[PDB]
Amino acid sequence: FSEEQLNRYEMYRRSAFPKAAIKRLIQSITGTSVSQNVVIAMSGISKVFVGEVVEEALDVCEKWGEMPPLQPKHMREAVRRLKSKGQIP
Amino acid sequence: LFSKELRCMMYGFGDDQNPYTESVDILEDLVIEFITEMTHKAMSI
Please list, residue by residue across A32-48, b when 16 or more beta carbons sit within 10 angstroms of its beta carbon and e when fewer do.
eebeeebbeebbeebbe
* Closest among B41, B19, B17, B40 to B28, alpha carbons compared: B19
Q: What is the DSSP string of A12-46?
A: HHH----HHHHHHHHHHHHSS---HHHHHHHHHHH
Distance between CA atoms of residues B30 and B13, nearest Å: 16
Specify the CATH architecture of the domain A1-89: Orthogonal Bundle (1.10)
Q: Which of A9, A21, A58 sits opposite B2 (nearest CB)?
A: A21
Contact A30 B41 (CB under 8 A): no
Q: Do A25 and B32 touch (CB under 8 A)?
A: yes
Residue ranges covered by each domain of chain A? 1-89
Taking CA–CA distances from A47, the nearest residue in chain B reads B9
Architecture field, domain B1-45: Orthogonal Bundle (1.10)
